[PDB]
Amino acid sequence: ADQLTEEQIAEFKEAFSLFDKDGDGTITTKELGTVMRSLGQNPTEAELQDMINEVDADGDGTIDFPEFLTMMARKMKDT
């Protein structure tokens, strides 16, 4: 896929459902911290605030399908 975007999108598609708490197609800082919790963890929208702002490319302070995709992808990059 060049960026394992295919295999990812696949899951990201079904996952998006979860990631999208509000269900407005947009993943709010909360929506992000929400999922994380489902992973047992218990992060704060604050810490995630720095992330959302980071991932947020369009510029505003929120995530999205294409936005998050980058986050996750770039996630493995960092590591």
Compute the least distance from the CB of residue 67 to Ca ion, in Å: 6
Compute the least distance from the CB of residue 60 to Ca ion, in Å: 4
Closest residue (Cβ) to Ca ion? 62
Using the minimum distance from each CB to Ca ion, give the nearer residue, 40 or 59.
Answer: 59
Q: What span, in angstroms and rounded, lies between the C-alpha atoms of 18 and 34?
A: 9
Compute the least distance from the CB of residue 40 to Ca ion, in Å: 26
Using the minimum distance from each CB to Ca ion, give the nearer residue, 2 or 24.
Answer: 24
- Which tokens sit at 53? 């702002």
Which residues make up the interface to Ca ion (CB under 5 A)? Answer: 56, 60, 62
Q: Is the CB of residue 67 less than 8 Å from the CB of residue 55? A: yes
- Residue labelled with tokens 């896929």: 1
CA distances from 72 to 2, 30, 53 (A): 15, 17, 14
